[PDB]
Amino acid sequence: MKNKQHVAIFPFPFGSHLPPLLNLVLKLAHIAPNTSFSFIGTHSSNAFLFTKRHIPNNIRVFTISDGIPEGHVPANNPIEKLDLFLSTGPDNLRKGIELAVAETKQSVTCIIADAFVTSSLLVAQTLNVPWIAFWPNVSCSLSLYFNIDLIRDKCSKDAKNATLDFLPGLSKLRVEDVPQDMLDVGEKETLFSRTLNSLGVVLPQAKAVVVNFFAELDPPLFVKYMRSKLQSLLYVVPLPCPQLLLPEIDSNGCLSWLDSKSSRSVAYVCFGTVVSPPPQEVVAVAEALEESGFPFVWALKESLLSILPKGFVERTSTRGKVVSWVPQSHVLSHGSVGVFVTHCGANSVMESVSNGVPMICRPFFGDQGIAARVIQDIWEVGVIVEGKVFTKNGFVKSLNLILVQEDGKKIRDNALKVKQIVQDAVGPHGQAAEDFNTLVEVISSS
Numbered sequence: 203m204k205n206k207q208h209v210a211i212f213p214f215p216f217g218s219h220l221p222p223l224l225n226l227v228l229k230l231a232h233i234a235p236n237t238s239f240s241f242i243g244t245h246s247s248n249a250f251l252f253t254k255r256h257i258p259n260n261i262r263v264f265t266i267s268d269g270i271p272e273g274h275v276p277a278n279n280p281i282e283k284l285d286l287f288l289s290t291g292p293d294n295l296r297k298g299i300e301l302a303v304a305e306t307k308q309s310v311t312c313i314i315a316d317a318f319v320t321s322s323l324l325v326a327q328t329l330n331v332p333w334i335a336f337w338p339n340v341s342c343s344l345s346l347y348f349n350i351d352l353i354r355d356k357c358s359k360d361a362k363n364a365t366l367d368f369l370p371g372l373s374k375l376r377v378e379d380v381p382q383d384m385l386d387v388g389e390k391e392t393l394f395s396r397t398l399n400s401l402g403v404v405l406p407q408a409k410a411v412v413v414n415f416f417a418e419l420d421p422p423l424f425v426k427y428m429r430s431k432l433q434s435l436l437y438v439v440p441l442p443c444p445q446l447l448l449p450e451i452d453s454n455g456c457l458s459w460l461d462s463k464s465s466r467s468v469a470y471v472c473f474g475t476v477v478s479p480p481p482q483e484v485v486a487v488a489e490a491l492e493e494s495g496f497p498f499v500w501a502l503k504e505s506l507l508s509i510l511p512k513g514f515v516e517r518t519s520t521r522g523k524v525v526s527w528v529p530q531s532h533v534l535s536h537g538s539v540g541v542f543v544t545h546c547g548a549n550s551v552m553e554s555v556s557n558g559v560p561m562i563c564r565p566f567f568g569d570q571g572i573a574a575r576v577i578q579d580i581w582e583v584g585v586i587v588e589g590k591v592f593t594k595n596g597f598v599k600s601l602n603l604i605l606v607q608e609d610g611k612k613i614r615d616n617a618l619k620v621k622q623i624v625q626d627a628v629g630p631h632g633q634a635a636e637d638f639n640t641l642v643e644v645i646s647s648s
């Protein structure tokens with residue numbers, strides 16, 4: 203009997219949502235080299251992943267519309283392009299299915315999609331095939347989508363520091379930690395935010411939900427709570443497959459520089475690539491790094507070099523690196539790095555906690571505030587920067603706290619404890635090992 207298994211993959215075709223899903227498909231394609239995997243992206247998303255890379259032959263790439271008609275120029279906000287792609291609907295997706303079916307001569311037996319591509323659930327129901335949701339976001343934020351009415355009711359009536367005790371295992375979460383887009387109603391409501399607010403209804407219809415995180419790092423009551431809301435909640439280790447990482451050159455010379463510093467002494471700063479912070483904070487971050495005296499690697503926009511204080515990069519050159527790019531995963535896995543100043547992106551948090559590096563947190567939007575709260579009040583592996591925004595005096599006090607002071611010994615100790623938990627979790631007898639195989643069997647019997 204010939205193998206007729208054919209998995210259709212629908213990523214959220216944007217930046218940070220692309221590597222973690224290809225990473226999962228790579229592992230799946232390796233353990234099941236007889237099963238066909240059809241990765242369906244846009245021209246820009248496919249150019250992003252598959253340009254340099256070489257992939258196993260049972261993975262095939264197909265192209266659909268980005269939702270941006272030719273001639274049109276999207277505005278400089280990170281939401282429009284997401285909206286335009288989401289507006290393509292299930293018909294654009296089914297076009298990707300057509301390309302897959304025509305190439306493999308196999309009908310689709312299973313679909314794996316990023317949870318945001320909620321239209322792929324519609325496709326899965328039409329084909330009568332199981333729908334598997336991939337969650338590359340902050341894991342703890344899954345619970346929010348099943349209590350939107352309560353969250354909205356509390357965020358309006360109650361104080362901003364009021365706790366969300368109705369969230370099992372996440373009582374530490376506050377009103378001010380809630381993503382703004384699930385509070386926005388009316389004109390400020392986007393197709394992207396309408397999609398995200400549909401998750402509490404969309405997610406339970408999934409055969410399985412695959413969380414790109416370590417099951418042992420989430421509050422047990424949260425995990426249990428989500429298992430009550432979903433048909434299946436699976437965790438698969440977010441650490442890269444050997445096929446994922448691309449051999450890249452240390453052009454800036456970050457690593458060799460880090461070897462010249464002593465253990466846990468360097469501050470690594472990178473506040474995202476999606477949202478640019480207000481120039482006054484950029485000035486404040488620069489001012490704080492200089493006043494502090496600590497060695498630092500600052501991954502900064504090339505376009506933000508002009509708003510930096512005059513002479514800053516030059517006066518700090520003998521103890522600091524201001525660069526356009528860093529091999530972040532390698533930088534965070536270096537012993538010299540003592541603190542990670544982050545916007546709290548799901549991937550950045552993953553990379554920091556798995557390397558025992560404590561974090562100074564300044565969340566900008568989305569689930570980054572959920573991440574920040576967990577880092578500070580739950581895992582206790584870092585702090586939100588004083589005042590929730592970057593200031594010269596506040597950020598220096600955060601740097602001092604984590605890097606050198608005895609008051610931050612608990613946090614540095616917890617950073618090491620969590621790393622050990624991750625190292626054990628990615629082990630052969632961790633949860634994900636059992637869960638990864640559950641996923642393979644779902645695909646096998648699809």
Ligand SMILES: COc1cc(-c2[o+]c3cc(O)cc(O)c3cc2O)cc(O)c1O
Pocket residue numbers: 216217218219280281284339340343381382383384398476567568569
């Ligand atoms: C990488 O592409 C983007 C992702 C996101 C994004 O927004 C979220 C918002 C939330 O409220 C909650 C989330 O979990 C998000 C995750 C994202 O990746 C937002 C953008 O403006 C983007 O451009």
